[PDB]
């Protein structure tokens, strides 16, 4: 017996902890968020990833490991939670997917101008009206530099953002 004010907050805290756990876990799997559909009978978790073959194990063991890790963390009964890995289309129109694609080119040590310009055109060809990539931090020197890459038009103020 929990009040509605604490229940809706507890529902949002669960989705916040579930999303962040899957970022540190499915980082190299193209994770791009989740959709939690809670029903009075059970709860189903929909994982959005650009590489679903890696979200699943060699024979589907990682998906079994995630649903077994969620039922133990959040007190879900056995067989009460189900995870459905889904494939998101138009990867260029996903800011999280393109941030991962850029991060895995930086740790490879290619560049910040050739890498961001390459990921800036993949987003423009994907049907985007505008993009903006900002890379800040230190690299090869003590002082930090901010490399900003813009393309198209970008709305900054107002509700449409």
């Amino acid at each position: 017996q929990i009040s509605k004010k604490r229940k809706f907050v507890a529902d949002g805290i669960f989705k916040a902890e579930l999303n962040e756990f899957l970022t540190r876990e499915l980082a190299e799997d193209g994770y791009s968020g989740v959709e939690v559909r809670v029903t009075p009978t059970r709860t189903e978790i929909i994982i959005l990833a650009t590489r679903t073959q890696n979200v699943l194990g060699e024979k589907g063991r990682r998906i079994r490991e995630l649903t077994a890790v969620v039922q133990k963390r959040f007190g879900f009964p056995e067989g009460g939670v189900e995870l459905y890995a889904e494939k998101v289309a138009t990867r260029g129109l996903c800011a999280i997917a393109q941030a991962e694609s850029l991060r895995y080119k930086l740790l490879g040590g290619l560049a910040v101008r050739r890498a961001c310009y390459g990921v800036l055109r993949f987003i423009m060809e994907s049907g985007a009206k505008g993009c903006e990539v900002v890379v800040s931090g230190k690299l090869r020197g003590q002082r930090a530099k901010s490399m900003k890459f813009v393309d198209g038009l970008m709305i900054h103020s107002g509700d449409p953002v």
């Binding site: 229940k7 809706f8 907050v9 009075p40």
Partner: protein
């Protein structure tokens, strides 16, 4: 007599399942009471923007509105349903 409580954070999806519940039950010749709209609850959280003490006393206000509608007769994500007797 069954009272169906509907609580959600978005009025569009809350009234979408509310209309389908009334319309879905009106075709069964069930005398239903109209959707009673409870006063909305705004979960106020006024925090400090800066993670330190150097900000110019700039606070940011958050809101989490919880709309509640009950149906007394004789589902989309984000909507809670609870039936009673």
């Amino acid at each position: 007599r069954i009272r169906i409580t509907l609580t959600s954070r978005n009025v569009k999806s809350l009234e979408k399942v509310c209309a389908d519940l009334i319309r879905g039950a009106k075709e069964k010749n069930l005398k239903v009471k109209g959707p009673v709209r409870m006063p909305t609850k705004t979960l106020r959280i006024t925090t400090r923007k800066t993670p330190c003490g150097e900000g110019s006393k700039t606070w940011d206000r958050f809101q989490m509105r919880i709309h509640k509608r009950l149906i007394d007769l004789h589902i989309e994500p984000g909507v809670e349903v609870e039936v009673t007797i």
